[PDB]
Amino acid sequence: HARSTGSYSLVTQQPLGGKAQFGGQRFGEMEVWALEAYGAAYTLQEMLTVKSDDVNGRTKMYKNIVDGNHQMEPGMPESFNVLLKEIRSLGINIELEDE
Amino acid sequence: ETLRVDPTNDRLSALVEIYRMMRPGEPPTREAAESLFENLFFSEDRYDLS
Amino acid sequence: ARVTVQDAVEKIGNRFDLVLVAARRARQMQVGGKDPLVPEENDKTTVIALREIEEGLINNQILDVRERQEQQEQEAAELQAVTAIAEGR
Amino acid sequence: LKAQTKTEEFDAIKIALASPDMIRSWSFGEVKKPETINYRTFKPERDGLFCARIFGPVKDYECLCGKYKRLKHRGVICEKCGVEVTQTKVRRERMGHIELASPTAHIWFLKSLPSRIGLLLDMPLRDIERVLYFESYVVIEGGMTNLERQQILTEEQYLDALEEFGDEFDAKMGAEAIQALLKSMDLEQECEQLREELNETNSETKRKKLTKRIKLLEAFVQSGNKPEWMILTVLPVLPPDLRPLVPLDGGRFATSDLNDLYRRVINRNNRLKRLLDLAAPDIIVRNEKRMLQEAVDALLDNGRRGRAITGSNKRPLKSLADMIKGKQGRFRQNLLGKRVDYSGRSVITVGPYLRLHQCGLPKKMALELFKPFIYGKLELRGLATTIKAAKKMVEREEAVVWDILDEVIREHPVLLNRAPTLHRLGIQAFEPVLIEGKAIQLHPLVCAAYNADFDGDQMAVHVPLTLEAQLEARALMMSTNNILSPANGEPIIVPSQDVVLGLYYMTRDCVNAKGEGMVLTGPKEAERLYRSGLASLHARVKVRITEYEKDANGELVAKTSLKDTTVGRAILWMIVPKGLPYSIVNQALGKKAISKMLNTCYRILGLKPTVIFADQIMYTGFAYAARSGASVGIDDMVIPEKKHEIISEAEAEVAEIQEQFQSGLVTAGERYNKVIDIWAAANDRVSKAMMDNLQTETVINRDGQEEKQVSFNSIYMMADSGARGSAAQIRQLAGMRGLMAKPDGSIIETPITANFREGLNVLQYFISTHGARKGLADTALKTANSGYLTRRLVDVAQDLVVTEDDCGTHEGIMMTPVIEGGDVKEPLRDRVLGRVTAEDVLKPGTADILVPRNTLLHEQWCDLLEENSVDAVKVRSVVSCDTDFGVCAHCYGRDLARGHIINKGEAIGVIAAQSIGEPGTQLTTGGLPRVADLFEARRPKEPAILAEISGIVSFGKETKGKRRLVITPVDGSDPYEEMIPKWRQLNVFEGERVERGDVISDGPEAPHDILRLRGVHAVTRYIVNEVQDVYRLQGVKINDKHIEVIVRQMLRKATIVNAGSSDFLEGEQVEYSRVKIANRELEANGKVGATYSRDLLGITKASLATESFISAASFQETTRVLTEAAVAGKRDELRGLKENVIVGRLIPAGTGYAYHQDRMRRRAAG
Amino acid sequence: GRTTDPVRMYMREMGTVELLTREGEIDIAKRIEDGINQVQCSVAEYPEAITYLLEQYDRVEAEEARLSDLITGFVD
Ligand SMILES: [Mg+2]
Ligand SMILES: [Zn+2]
Ligand SMILES: [Zn+2]
């Protein structure tokens, strides 16, 4: 199996096969630790932000990949962004401070 | 010594403590305790070892 | 290809900062602002930057210096343009 | 400069209780109806859970009514039905609210184990609930009449009390009552009064609780939270798209359970309002209020009261707390895993042709993976008009695209990963080599690191998109850049099986073979002699060789001589680079020596030569092993001729002991033991028969009659070389195999007399089956145990990262060889290697400093230490490091995949945890559970006791269940008297002096003790040595370092004794504390500095305390963490790994360490 | 005791109320009649209550309202 940019899950925006065009490989906790032992921050960020969970960063990445500019303008992963709404849906006020 | 730990006295008492065990919180009734206890292991309907 | 980056790691100690510096330079080349300091073998900007670290003509100090110069190189151009903004008064 | 208003890049995060107005801030409208969608036109019914007016447009940039459809109209609120036309994405954002008729308790603050509303009001839970259900009346602000403020009354009691006192007395019931209680509460006054009461009365019982509660109160005050907020006035509604109604195939619909819940809360709420305007009796409106409470509770967190079930379906509906918690134990969707683009996977194959730095990548896979790169490159050179045309080109697979793919692949590494990722080598970067076929090819030398067999294991590929990822992969995760295990400096690139059989068969010698005794000019003509068929691969021969030694100063010396060697060793020597001596290849080259070859090569010539060397070794190994024609036949397994006789004699023994049992000469049990002993001894005999016969029996002739050497038999060469097979399995092949054991743990007294070379009958096989099944079960379980352990470990360490450079302390532990009971179970050289000296060390004579204070001891320094007789070296450790909130590289060690000192910013805790965890599969009170017991600090079952204080001791009082022990210090006061139960056999001499930490009894001891009585270095030594005993008994190599960092994380907290700033008994960070008393020792108070006592917390216990709450919410119980943090208004600053991973930004370590540092210093500054 | 499960704290709370006798129903209904009729009569004794009805019927015949928005009908 191989996938570049496929379809995406609705509830949380995440890679999902809808065509039998397969959903991406699942990058788990242990793999994250494996990246953490190495000094690689950017591989990990791109792994859990732009390559997956960022509804903005993914396309903005694609355009750069084709333009010949390798970068990432990551933004915030939609999982955590949903978690904020889920927490705030209760009587719990969770805010993002400062600058 | 099992009897000395037994809170009950007569048949109705035991049936009360059984019915209130199986379906607790709700007020016990004579016909209710009898019905339940007879319905558990003694009813051709609700019980079979075959 | 560059099989082992060890020599570059020798040139700048940290080895994480190696990734950083080589990155910054690799972008100086990839986004077209500059040109290689050493023959490109078809090596991608990734490896070209590493060769540049290995040959000791590129690191954080050198880069900061160059960029700091270019700031004044543009400040030289705009010199009349921005002073024409005396409309501030 | 104007600070800012709108979006910056945020730091930290805050959590707290929500005001009604604060809740209204988020809300863009009130949902007044349970209605969802219209049922024909599927458009949202206005003012409902799904609403275009409140939340957002159904379709992008379009009004609901349809009047304004143009992308131009944007900030416009439609005059018909107000909907601001904007992207439908905002329906995923905008929140809502519901105004509840009656107040309502928030289930999280009612039912959390330490009930917040309860202990804030100093009121029991059962009372509060009894009041909430209208099952009783509670007083509020009782005034001076008859009654306590928090006192609870009944119907009749409330009536009587009301008849007596009309006013100046107050009582309510239900939610409104509790809210009235919380609102009326004055925290400050309580503070003052409680401080006074704390001061006045002396009882442990009184002031313990007193101080606990005052601390709680002042904390809640400082929070910014006002108690009323635990009772919900307004209830926020979650955005529609986070609980969608979206359609399916067959015209069917599917929706989140929250709707079912929310709807209910609305209905009942509205109904309650109705029941107010209709002036209903109390009994009704009460029931409606309770129902509303239940509905809201079910919505927020379901399962804490009734567990409501979803419509038409038995399965309980999922609530918001269940949405947050997630599942698979503790996993928050970052933790369990996340799907990732630009990736793939497949079955893997060999590819021995590969250099160690590359891997075979299927063409199609590389095509689909690099697709955007290919698109961009195709129109970069102008082979495609536009991106669309590029797609059509690669989709047509036009011949021209393959070369473009060859371009985009070249310098662009790919990440390879296997299924059970344990240590960091579970993921490695490779250079892709385009290969026809659907299988991934993986370099054999790497197969060890992945623990990847070829039996159908699959591997996954990931593309390093951003430039920084390419350089991270190439300079960090690259294959050639990790040649060494992070656990120990030994090479992980060690040749595996076929290759080592190759080199073993290569340099070996038989007694007589073609070319024996002759002489050759050099290895070239030795090989030339061999390939032509003149000389045998193995024959004793003198040949001239030129070796090199770099032993000059950075300079290679050369020397030539006639070496007595074989033909094979001569040919092989051609590969060995430069400064290595010929001595290394002149031996038989087993799996062990062939490793030390690579190792020495690395510690001498550096990285590159070691890499290319290793590659060459693999190639030649495969080649020559293939040439050798090694095979396995049925006659390759030789059974002893004396087997049957051994069996017979041992069989006589059993009938002898049996005859003795028949005559009663021996008891049944003693009989059993006897027979079992004779059978075991027999097994040993047959084993040591077949071992001799198989090993030496080649009996051959050189120029004379005879001579005998080690056998050339296939299976023996296999087992001996280290390729595959071992004396045990070989023993199972030829000699009899074992005496099996019945499930209950007993061992059958009639062993398996047959073996695999012969047939096993019905019984023997049936009995073998249990051993097999228990084997598979046990191993499959120990995998899980290992994993759980690594989990706990990384949880307890993680954020530990090398931060400062040198803390500069002379502190360290004394390193001696382990020297256990025999001779040297582990040397000094291994213990001190790659570590750094705490202070300068002496020769046997002095004012001669061999190693000067803190210097990395590498192989040369350790060998210099070995030249001299020095038996002891004090060494800096990560446990003693003066640096707070991390470890200085100077205290850690050099150890890495590279020999240089540890880099600034590498995250050591994680690699330590991984290093301990990976080998855990191989571990077998004792064992892996013993390790787990150790790291958990658990007090053993039948522990010993250590002398509390030095000095002469004696026995006192009498038998109550404890016979008291009275200690007598020389100068100091006596009063320490410990109660020791006397039915435990003692050790301590009634008439002798015992040092503190001596043996007052026997049995294992709790490390809490060892820390307290013996000291910190003592306890860390105990942990490291015991766990290392466990691992080393299994043959596992793990450096003491990692264990030491784990230990440091275990001892992170301590409990103060003295005072002058903070509270007395508090468990707290020794980082915080030590930095505070180092700060207090000068300036401040002249010295008010407080004494502490170091504490020992188990790993699972130490992982509990984490400053960041976002981190804690991950692996701990989510609900409790969120509540308990929300009350104190705790502000998470991030700063750690887990939290930053969760929030999705750069890791504050490694490559990212530069960023955070630059940010960390900018913070709290000018 | 209270097992929670609000069905119960209802069932037991209403179960206290004693069933009505056939006479008690008529008693209570009579009480209702008494009560209401009091407020009706009290309304009848208010001058503004009359004048208002007048001003409203003058608006009904003036086509500013309908007869349904004032009276449900009289006795008749
Ligand atoms: Mg396998
Ligand atoms: Zn409209
Ligand atoms: Zn240190």
mmCIF file of N, CA and C in Angstrom, chain D residues 104 346 1006 1086:
data_model
loop_
_atom_site.group_PDB
_atom_site.id
_atom_site.type_symbol
_atom_site.label_atom_id
_atom_site.label_comp_id
_atom_site.label_asym_id
_atom_site.label_seq_id
_atom_site.Cartn_x
_atom_site.Cartn_y
_atom_site.Cartn_z
ATOM 1 N N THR D 104 -28.194 23.965 38.343
ATOM 2 C CA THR D 104 -27.842 22.557 38.199
ATOM 3 C C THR D 104 -26.397 22.295 38.608
ATOM 4 N N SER D 346 4.706 -2.515 3.160
ATOM 5 C CA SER D 346 4.621 -3.783 2.421
ATOM 6 C C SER D 346 5.510 -4.887 2.992
ATOM 7 N N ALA D 1006 13.465 -2.782 51.835
ATOM 8 C CA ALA D 1006 12.841 -1.714 51.059
ATOM 9 C C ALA D 1006 13.847 -0.594 50.857
ATOM 10 N N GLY D 1086 19.280 35.949 56.272
ATOM 11 C CA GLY D 1086 20.728 35.775 56.245
ATOM 12 C C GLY D 1086 21.098 34.331 55.968
#
